[PDB]
Amino acid sequence: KFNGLTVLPPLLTDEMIAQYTSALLAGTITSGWTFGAGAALQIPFAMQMAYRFNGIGVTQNVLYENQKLIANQFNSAIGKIQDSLSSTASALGKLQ
Amino acid sequence: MQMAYRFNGIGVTQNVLYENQKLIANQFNSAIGKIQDSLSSTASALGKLQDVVNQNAQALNTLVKQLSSNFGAISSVLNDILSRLDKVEAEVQIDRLITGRLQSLQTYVTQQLIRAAEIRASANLAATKMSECVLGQSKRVDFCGKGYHLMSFPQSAPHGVVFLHVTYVPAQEKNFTTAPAICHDGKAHFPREGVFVSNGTHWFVTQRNFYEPQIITTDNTFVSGNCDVVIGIVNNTVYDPLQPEL
Amino acid sequence: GRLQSLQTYVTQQLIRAAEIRASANLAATKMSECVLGQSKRVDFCGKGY
Amino acid sequence: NKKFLPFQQFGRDIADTTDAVRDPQTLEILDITPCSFGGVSVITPGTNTSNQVAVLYQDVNCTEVNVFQTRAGCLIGAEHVNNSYECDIPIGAGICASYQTSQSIIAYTMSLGAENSVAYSNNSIAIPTNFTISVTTEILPVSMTKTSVDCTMYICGDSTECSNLLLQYGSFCTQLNRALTGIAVEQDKNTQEVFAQVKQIYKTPPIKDFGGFNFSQILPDPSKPSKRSFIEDLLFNKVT
Amino acid sequence: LLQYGSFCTQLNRALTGIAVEQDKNTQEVFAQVKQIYKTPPIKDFGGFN
Amino acid sequence: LLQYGSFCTQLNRALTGIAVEQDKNTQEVFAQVKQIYKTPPIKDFGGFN
Ligand SMILES: *[C@@H]1O[C@H](CO)[C@@H](O)[C@H](O)[C@H]1NC(C)=O
Ligand SMILES: *[C@@H]1O[C@H](CO)[C@@H](O)[C@H](O)[C@H]1NC(C)=O
Ligand SMILES: *[C@@H]1O[C@H](CO)[C@@H](O)[C@H](O)[C@H]1NC(C)=O
Ligand SMILES: *[C@@H]1O[C@H](CO)[C@@H](O)[C@H](O)[C@H]1NC(C)=O
Ligand SMILES: *[C@@H]1O[C@H](CO)[C@@H](O)[C@H](O)[C@H]1NC(C)=O
Ligand SMILES: *[C@@H]1O[C@H](CO)[C@@H](O)[C@H](O)[C@H]1NC(C)=O
Ligand SMILES: *[C@@H]1O[C@H](CO)[C@@H](O)[C@H](O)[C@H]1NC(C)=O
Ligand SMILES: *[C@@H]1O[C@H](CO)[C@@H](O)[C@H](O)[C@H]1NC(C)=O
Ligand SMILES: *[C@@H]1O[C@H](CO)[C@@H](O)[C@H](O)[C@H]1NC(C)=O
Ligand SMILES: *[C@@H]1O[C@H](CO)[C@@H](O)[C@H](O)[C@H]1NC(C)=O
Ligand SMILES: *[C@@H]1O[C@H](CO)[C@@H](O)[C@H](O)[C@H]1NC(C)=O
16 A cells, blocks of 8 residues: 555546536537637527538428427436436446 | 638638638738747747657667666676686676566567557557548548648658648637528528528528628528427518519 | 566556557547537447437 | 454554554554655756756655645645646646746646636527638657667677577577567558558649749758758757 | 666656656546636526436 | 465456457457348349449
């Protein structure tokens, strides 16, 4: 244990990496794909999802004409991923 | 015409090049001048390569300075041990020196072999950036420099390559009022490729990376559905070019 | 013996540090491409479109 | 606060280290913890800049003795500042040292960046009205210095008794020579992967009309003896 | 142990290079942006929670 | 040999980790799909052979 084997602290603390991921999420939500290529450009979030549906070939009418179902599928998938991280620690073994 | 195609590759209409060609040429030449001055001023910009040279030279200096170690023998110099001892008595000290120097060589070869794996990983990355940033145009975000990649330029360096990434950074933003659709006669109008903007009075359609307004016509847009599903559909008249013709 | 033990520890730490560096270059690439942009690379940013 | 069985003399830990003892004279349970050792780090700016020096005492705090405690440890010679700057010399745990302004070494908390609040609305979009051609430099190493160490010349310098005692150890010498030869062959495979992409050698026409772009800094000027360009000729003089 | 030259200095060079590379890994992954952003307190994100 | 500590178990740990990684490699390359597909015996593939 203490036979000369000193564990050094990291430079970025866990609060600093949490503020970094906070900044990344606020950037992707409020701007989208534009804050990594210069300044941050505000876009309402339904237009981010429409212009990300255009990026996969789906016409953007599918988003606006199904916005509530896409919202419900997204929120239910977030709930399922919270359940899979709260009741199971199998994929986190990659870190362990 | 290459940069007309390369502005089309980042979602910009190629009139933006030809109607700004001298300004883009001046910005490119001034940024080349800024690189030349930023390299002729500071001598530590090439530190990625000096780390390789300095670490390899420190490994060789360590390998040399392990020769002056006794390793349990009477002397580091082999000829002293050969000249002062019996042929049975000298072989013990010679075995100690051989064991220590062979441990030194195994350490140096293991260290160089790991360091060679790291140099190969960066060389595979540099070959990928030569094939994709330079030899084509990459849509991969912030792989070929921060911004929207336009073209990339290889330059040599001691034990390394240096890429000059010509990118596109949008500069002067301006707040606008937008809406996901237009309600015209009970139909919904979605833009073909662009976004609806309005300066305050009249609704326009413009592509997303440069502000060039277009009066909303039936060929800028795309009819789908009705005015009761889209959350935020607004009211304006879509222009029809057949109406001042018939 | 103890010096061989410490040098064996150092060698395996160098190899594991290289493996961690490879996965962290994946992680930096996936922030630069999955997060900051919208990727066209298939099965790089999850299964699907 | 441990509690031995009524015969046990001392204690161990997971690491087979004596972590606790019982006093032989009086029945009480002591607790062995080693004395506060730790590394000493010397934070410095350049000698080509100054000679003011701070000193880091890692993993221990200021028992020994501008003396302040960090999570990295005690820190003597530094001046704590309630501001927050860009990180200059790291110390540990979000604390960076820098040689600011009369000029003494300060030690502060690292600033992650300029704080910003992007406006967001149901109706607000920001379209750019202008642009800027940014030209950026990435520097990647391709190859490493090729090296072969003749192991017999290294271990036994002009000797024949030593050569025979080295022959007793089997085939270590050929193994090391073979590994370094594999490295030195990889170091040419790397440059043939990176540079030799294109088989036809192309050359630029003498009438250079490129729509207004000036490519003089990067194209080679053949008036030089070595036919390389200005930026390459600057790059070959900044790596020693 | 002094009669073995500089094995200890070399092992500390290796472990220090590893530690500096771990800080480079976490800063290459997370420190992608240089302006820290904050969401507005009214979260009208089209209905996504 | 039992006076040289935990060298042997460490060597077997290293080789077993290598072998488990080899099965991880050949599984992550080839097993991209979880349904074995078949081509129909009528091969009208637009003229390609
Ligand atoms: C856009 O609006 C936001 C919030 O009102 C403001 O901070 C920003 O300066 C505005 N930008 C322009 C270009 O008007
Ligand atoms: C918006 O642009 C139109 C162009 O037809 C112009 O008539 C109008 O005055 C402009 N309004 C504002 C507020 O700039
Ligand atoms: C705009 O904001 C109001 C509340 O201020 C909200 O009711 C409305 O839904 C928003 N517009 C859209 C298109 O969602
Ligand atoms: C937009 O126009 C339709 C009729 O075309 C009308 O029913 C609707 O109320 C209008 N929208 C608003 C917000 O008044
Ligand atoms: C180093 O210091 C000398 C004098 O102390 C000074 O002339 C020189 O400019 C310094 N080096 C640099 C790179 O500034
Ligand atoms: C060292 O740290 C311990 C625990 O934080 C504290 O009790 C003690 O007072 C510190 N020593 C000095 C000299 O500050
Ligand atoms: C920084 O602020 C804290 C709290 O106000 C105070 O205790 C401390 O003395 C300040 N530091 C300096 C160097 O004045
Ligand atoms: C864009 O910016 C340049 C300076 O970089 C300026 O000369 C030019 O007039 C600007 N263009 C517009 C349309 O404002
Ligand atoms: C291009 O720029 C260089 C910069 O030194 C200058 O010497 C040269 O005369 C310029 N040539 C043209 C064609 O503008
Ligand atoms: C979002 O989800 C959380 C927990 O799942 C819930 O407490 C909150 O009310 C939800 N917000 C909305 C707007 O539904
Ligand atoms: C495909 O090629 C093979 C060998 O060239 C041939 O035997 C076979 O008949 C070909 N298929 C068809 C449909 O002709």
